[PDB]
């Protein structure tokens, strides 16, 4: 009922269970050329 208590209201629950084909994203910075840098191209360091 839309007027009952707070924990007596419908709560939607999604449970994520983990077990290699799903990872988090990889953040790509910028390419700066003509400077001595410390690169990581796709795991090639």
């Amino acid at each position, epitope marked *: 009922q839309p*007027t*009952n*208590g707070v924990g007596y209201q419908p709560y939607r629950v999604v449970v994520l269970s983990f077990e290699a084909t799903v990872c988090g994203p990889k953040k790509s910075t910028n390419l700066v050329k003509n400077k001595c840098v410390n690169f990581n191209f796709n795991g090639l360091t």
Partner: antibody
Amino acid sequence: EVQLVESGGGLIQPGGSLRLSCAASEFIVSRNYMSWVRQAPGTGLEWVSVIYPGGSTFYADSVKGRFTISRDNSKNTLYLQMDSLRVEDTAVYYCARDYGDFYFDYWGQGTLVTVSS
Amino acid sequence: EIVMTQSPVSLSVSPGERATLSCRASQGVASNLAWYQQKAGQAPRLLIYGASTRATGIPARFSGSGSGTEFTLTISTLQSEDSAVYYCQQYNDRPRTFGQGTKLEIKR
């Protein structure tokens, strides 16, 4: 035939131990939902414990740690072992069959325990 | 928890007067109430479950209803075997707390 006949009551010292029994009729103790309830004068009717099909033993917060329930599967019996009984534990104990954990469907006749010096 | 309170704690009523008993629930439950009757040295039967349904063999004398914060049981024709203790109990809150008991007797 619905019967819930109880036993195990008697006079014990404060700080002693005893053991209850609730023989059930025509339904299964270990597979149905039932509960141990108490009634003392001056206080209201009070829930003590509830027991599930296999499930879990759920106690009151006042008696948690002190009472234990161990149903014995040889017949339709339900027990409760009472250890470290306090002074306020003079009550008649009832075994009551539940509709899960909603409401008390059926009751016993109760066995009354008096603890005193 | 819901701490129960019966307002008509003791009611002496003529043999058949359509007597009125009540309780209030200190929290908000929609219709989560069951009414109980404990007789003298007997097993306390349920009377009403869900605050609007008569369970098994409970007659049309009992017309208990109510919601939210006020609940009322109506007893109609008052045989002398109804001189008993009337409880009201919620379904919603663990731990379950019973009513304090309504002592109903018939004057002779």
